[PDB]
Amino acid sequence: MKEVNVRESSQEREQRIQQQWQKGNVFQQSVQNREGYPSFVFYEGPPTANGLPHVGHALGRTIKDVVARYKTMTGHQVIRKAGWDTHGLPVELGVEKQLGISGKHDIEKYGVEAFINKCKESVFVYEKQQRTFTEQLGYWVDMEDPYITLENSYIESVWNVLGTIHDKGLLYKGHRVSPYCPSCQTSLSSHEVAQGYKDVKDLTVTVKFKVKNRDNEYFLGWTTTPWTLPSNVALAVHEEMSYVRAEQGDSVYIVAEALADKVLKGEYSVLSHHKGNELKGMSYEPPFNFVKVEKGHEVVTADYVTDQSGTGVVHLAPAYGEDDYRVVKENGFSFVNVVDEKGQYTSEVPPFQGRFVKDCDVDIVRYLANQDVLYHKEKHEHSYPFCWRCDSPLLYYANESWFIQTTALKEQFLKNNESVKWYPDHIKHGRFGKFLENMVDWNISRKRYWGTPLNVWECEGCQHQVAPKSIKELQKHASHYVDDSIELHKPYVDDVQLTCPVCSGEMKRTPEVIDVWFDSGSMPFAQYHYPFENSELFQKQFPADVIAEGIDQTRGWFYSLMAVSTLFTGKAPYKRVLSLGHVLDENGQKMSKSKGNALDPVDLIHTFGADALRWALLADSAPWNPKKFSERVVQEAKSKVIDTLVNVYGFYVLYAKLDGYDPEQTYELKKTKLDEWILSRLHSTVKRATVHLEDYGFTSAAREIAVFIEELSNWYVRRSRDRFWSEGMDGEKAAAYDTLHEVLVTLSQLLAPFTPFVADDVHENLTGKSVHLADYPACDQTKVNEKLEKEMAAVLQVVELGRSIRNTHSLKVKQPLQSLSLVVTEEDVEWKAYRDVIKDELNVKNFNVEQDDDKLVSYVLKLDFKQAGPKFGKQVNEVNQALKNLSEEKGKEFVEQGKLSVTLASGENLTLETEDVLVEKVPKEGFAVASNGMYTAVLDTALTEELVQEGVAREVIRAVQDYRKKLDLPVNSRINLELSGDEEVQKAVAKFETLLQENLLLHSLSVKETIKNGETVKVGTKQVVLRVLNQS
Ligand SMILES: CC[C@H](C)[C@H](N)C(=O)NS(=O)(=O)NC[C@H]1O[C@@H](n2cnc3c(N)ncnc32)[C@H](O)[C@@H]1O
Ligand SMILES: [Zn+2]
Ligand SMILES: [Zn+2]
């Protein structure tokens, strides 16, 4: 079974394991071997094929992989089909940059087909880069037969979904004020808008509107967007709000009563009161008269007008605000637009014609000053929407768009969300639920070229709508031949016309493509070409038991999945969501190619291994909140966890080969208490890690396993090395091999979801079988020993205290010390059974357990000046010296009694209060103390000549052993040793001759004054010459 561990880099090991997986079809087999087992349904969120993966993209892939691998080992069939997101602005803008073009006109000049072909080439390149990263990460997901949103079958399924929605009356065209990108030149959905808010500072202005058929009378109108003033059509007031005409100097101003003292400043006199109902119908003069409004420039009532802020009179521009649009339409007032598709001023506004409307703000203000209509200006700091792709400021623009009527099913939305288990829980009614509660209809139409065509044909004659669900329906309705090979993209589908079933007129397809989020949201149905194929497989693969993606999908794939599934089937498409916090750099800053702070995950995988990167991503911090990350954490994962497992595994393999241990052979076993302890810790770790994984606590399970690995290396193997080093297969050595074999097999199984490469290396070399075809190990409670674990933990605490004392007092563990005393308050731990271990680890001749420190401490008394200065006056220092002069028993007496007296030099006796004396408990001479509260270790640090000489003899023994290894001698060869050194070394060697002979297989030992051709070694601070003569 066991072959060998070799000097190989992490990359070489992982490449070898990957090749093993390829030759054996291990991923395929881990799916197929679970046929007939219960299903665990997993949906892969399709990464966008528009860029190179960064380290953040390794998080979800890792977590998904863990889940899938874990669910496979606990007896589920987990089908994993990969997907790529290939449409939309996320691809189009990058391709435009590659081509050095921008805007729809440039694309039309370039050619729609040529631009689309460029998009296809780009997405293919990025797909391959993503695929290589995914394979090197060890995330098993089928990328040889993935779903791709640009494939015809996927688009046909999307078309079927959209047509079914249209059948329900929930897909409609409407002229609405929608968020709009002036650069991308398209409307955007509400989730896209939610992804792009930034804090900005701009100007809100109060402007005078001359009342008509009056003189020196002006309405005070308010706006937060000065650039819409040329498009003014009306002024809005609340009908039940009280307004005032107030004289100020030569003029009269109309303003809300509650706001007049704020708007009017310096001097004013209120002449009359009017309700907003009365101000209705009064005409006025617009600040800009470039635009001609045939019906407008009046005052109207609107219930949303507030007296909390502004003036109570609100400028209304119907094309650039939803409320303005609704109110202007209700009163019959006319709709005017002064902005082109790029956000620039149209010809109807001459002075700024051809400039972005927002950038014209400042000039507008001065223009207002030159017409003498400005009244106030104020800075406004607020959240404003920016495009989630181009980063341009958005505009609210009247535009004809296609909507999915999500609001019609809002209740069902909420119901479906109520059935979903969210990790972390707060997303359910927080980030996600709050977005559901504020639902607006889904604007899906994009005036772009690369994407899923909106499959709605409209009759030029009577505007009847037909939405083909399939290529067959498209062919059926077409007025001309349509080949079976038709590609469902622009411009090919724009050359397909239909005959209107109503009037036989020409039906043309609406030109738009759909929002990319619809493509990804349709994957449960489109990944298997439902309902045209794989109906049984689709039924078995719906809904998902889990999905796991980043938190941004709360305004993304989580929403688009929920929306498409609710509109199409009414059902929730997933039962459970893992919403992952984004990975940041070590400073907490978001990683970007522009910033240059993005770590290359491929380089990290090459340097430290995918196992290390995954472990760092899982164990350094939880996946729910934003995660600081660094190369250092990957380094620490590799050195502390992965390397440790590899070293233990190689140790086992080497010595099992040398001693000819065969796990199939039945040996007589003499299991020690350390074997039992490590087995108990193993099965306890199995239990706790399983419990955490069942609740998707990856971090806690990883940390538990890491604790077990540290205990296995630093304590079990290190203290059991002699049993592997010894010669002859006694019961104790066989028990050691059996214990380590069980630990390695079960541990590699536990680690299989976390660190798949090294886990398979260990498991396959030890068992001949891949760990990823294995069952997750069960906890054997009969091997759990809670008492032994508790006692061993106490022993470890004592050992750490002893080491701390030795380090504080520069007493190297190679130097034996006389005693350790452990003061313990309770008989919790059977210390006797561990005496040897403790005496071994701290190198002490005696280990004594005491219930009190009476025999180990003394008391030293001093005076508290801050509490007793005035009482003793000039005698304070004399009293303090007398206190420092009392005997040990006097200090013990003060500690017991609390009352003390000091007899000063003059013979005067003085009484000391408890608060006057500062008490110090010191260790007895030669002793040093460390304490964790529960345990107090007192170490005898006093050195004798005998102790020092024993230390020198130990150093000589070690030097001789090292020299024997250096000269490559047989382990059974008895040697003639010649030793030269000063008299301290000679006396130490002579006194401990017996010990040297027990620890060295010496035929003769000669102490010589001078050694010819001898090796000079360092024994402590001394130099000693050694020489071997026979059997060298
Ligand atoms: C589910 C996929 C969506 C439909 C879409 N194609 C998309 O967002 N595609 S992506 O490639 O941009 N994102 C892939 C996954 O990585 C997450 N992610 C993106 N940026 C980070 C980051 N900085 N830190 C951690 N995770 C991050 C996404 O949420 C998605 O899960
Ligand atoms: Zn944009
Ligand atoms: Zn018609």
Per DSSP, the residues of 364-399 read HHHHHHHTT-EEEEEEEEEEEEB-TTT-PBPEEEEE
**Of 64, 71, 85, 468, which one is the catalytic site residue?**
85
Q: Which amino acid is at 649?
A: Y
Residues recorded for the chain: 1032
Quote the CA–CA distance of 890 and 877 in Å, as a whole number.
19
> Any catalytic annotation for residue 353?
no
Quote the CA–CA distance of 51 and 74 in Å, as a whole number.
36
Taking alpha carbons only, the member of 522, 420, 451 closest to residue 43 is 522
Quote the CA–CA distance of 594 and 97 in Å, as a whole number.
15
Quote the CA–CA distance of 920 and 861 in Å, as a whole number.
6
Q: Which amino acid is at 25?
A: N
Quote the CA–CA distance of 354 and 1020 in Å, as a whole number.
87
**Of 517, 615, 677, 831, which one is the catalytic site residue?**
517
Structure tokens at 673: 């208490």
181 is in an annotated binding site: yes
User: What residue spans of 237-289 are helical by DSSP H?
Assistant: 257-263, 276-279
Q: Are 63 and 548 in contact (CB under 8 A)?
A: yes
Give residues with Cβ within 8 angstroms of 9, minimum separation 6: none
Q: Are 545 and 573 in contact (CB under 8 A)?
A: no
For the Cβ of 756 lying below 6 angstroms from any atom of ligand 1, the answer is no
Query: What are residue 421's DSSP bridge partners?
Result: 576
> Any catalytic annotation for residue 77?
no
What sign results for the dihedral spanned by CA atoms 224, 226, 232, 234?
positive
Task: Scan for tokens 């107090």, then name that residue.
Answer: 936
Q: Identify the residue whose C-alpha is closest to ligand 1 atom 9.
A: 47
360 is in an annotated binding site: no
- Cis before residue 543, ω within 30 degrees of 0? yes
> Any catalytic annotation for residue 323?
no
Taking alpha carbons only, the member of 447, 493, 443, 450 closest to residue 468 is 493
Q: Are 967 and 958 in contact (CB under 8 A)?
A: no
Say what the resolution is, in angstroms. Answer: 2.3
* Residues with C-beta atoms within 5 A of ion ligand 2: 181, 183-184, 387, 389-390
Quote the CA–CA distance of 777 and 75 in Å, as a whole number.
11
Q: Identify the residue whose C-alpha is closest to ligand 1 atom 17.
A: 550
How far is C-alpha 775 from the chain's CA centre?
Answer: 28
Give residues with Cβ within 8 angstroms of 622, minimum separation 6: 581, 699
Q: Are 394 and 180 in contact (CB under 8 A)?
A: yes
**Of 18, 46, 53, 441, which one is the catalytic site residue?**
46
- Residue 580 Cα to ligand 1 midpoint, Å, equals 10
Of the listed ligands, the closest to the CA of 447 is: 2
- Residue 166 Cα to ligand 2 midpoint, Å, equals 28
Taking alpha carbons only, the member of 588, 716, 597, 709 closest to residue 645 is 709
How far is C-alpha 420 from the chain's CA centre?
Answer: 21
Query: What are residue 813's DSSP bridge partners?
Result: none
| Third-level CATH fold of 631-782 | Isoleucyl-tRNA Synthetase; Domain 1 (1.10.730)
DSSP string, 627-645: EE--HHHHHHHIIIIIHHH
503 is in an annotated binding site: yes
> Any catalytic annotation for residue 210?
no
595 is in an annotated binding site: no
CA distances from 348 to 229, 294, 340, 501, 554 (A): 13, 14, 11, 42, 42
Q: CB 239: neighbour CB atoms within 10 A?
A: 15
Quote the CA–CA distance of 465 and 843 in Å, as a whole number.
91
- Residue 707 Cα to ligand 1 midpoint, Å, equals 32
Quote the CA–CA distance of 739 and 727 in Å, as a whole number.
18
Question: Is 37-170+409-435+512-580 assigned to CATH 3.40.50.620?
Answer: yes
Query: What are residue 373's DSSP bridge partners?
Result: none
184 is in an annotated binding site: yes
For the Cβ of 583 lying below 6 angstroms from any atom of ligand 1, the answer is yes
For the Cβ of 549 lying below 6 angstroms from any atom of ligand 1, the answer is yes
Quote the CA–CA distance of 877 and 276 in Å, as a whole number.
89
Cα angle: 956, vertex 959, 962; to 5 degrees: 150
Taking the CA of residue 919 as centre, how many other CA atoms within 13 Å lie in the half-sphere pointing to its CB? 20
**Of 262, 329, 540, 590, which one is the catalytic site residue?**
590
Q: CB 484: neighbour CB atoms within 10 A?
A: 7
**Domain locations in the chain?**
37-170+409-435+512-580, 200-317+346-382, 457-509, 631-782, 857-923, 945-1028
Taking alpha carbons only, the member of 143, 144, 151, 126 closest to residue 54 is 126
Of the listed ligands, the closest to the CA of 392 is: 2
Of the listed ligands, the closest to the CA of 83 is: 1
Structure tokens at 677: 């302890």
Taking the CA of residue 579 as centre, how many other CA atoms within 13 Å lie in the half-sphere pointing to its CB? 23
> Any catalytic annotation for residue 457?
no
Secondary-structure class of domain 200-317+346-382 per CATH: alpha beta
- Residue 44 Cα to ligand 2 midpoint, Å, equals 27
Quote the CA–CA distance of 669 and 723 in Å, as a whole number.
13
For the Cβ of 50 lying below 6 angstroms from any atom of ligand 1, the answer is no
- Cβ burial 19-29 (10 Å sphere, 16+ → b, else e): eebeeeebbee
Of the listed ligands, the closest to the CA of 53 is: 1
Structure tokens at 433: 């639920």
> Any catalytic annotation for residue 590?
yes
Cα angle: 955, vertex 961, 966; to 5 degrees: 125
**Of 415, 434, 593, 790, which one is the catalytic site residue?**
593
> Any catalytic annotation for residue 557?
yes
Taking alpha carbons only, the member of 473, 470, 451, 467 closest to residue 509 is 467
Ligand 1 atom closest to the CA of 557, numbered from 1:
4
Collapsed DSSP state (helix, strand, coil) of residue 966:
helix
Instruction: For residue 347, give the DSSP letter.
Output: T
- Residue 508 Cα to ligand 3 midpoint, Å, equals 11
For the Cβ of 48 lying below 6 angstroms from any atom of ligand 1, the answer is yes
Collapsed DSSP state (helix, strand, coil) of residue 243:
strand
Q: Which amino acid is at 704?
A: E
Quote the CA–CA distance of 515 and 158 in Å, as a whole number.
12
Q: CB 81: neighbour CB atoms within 10 A?
A: 17
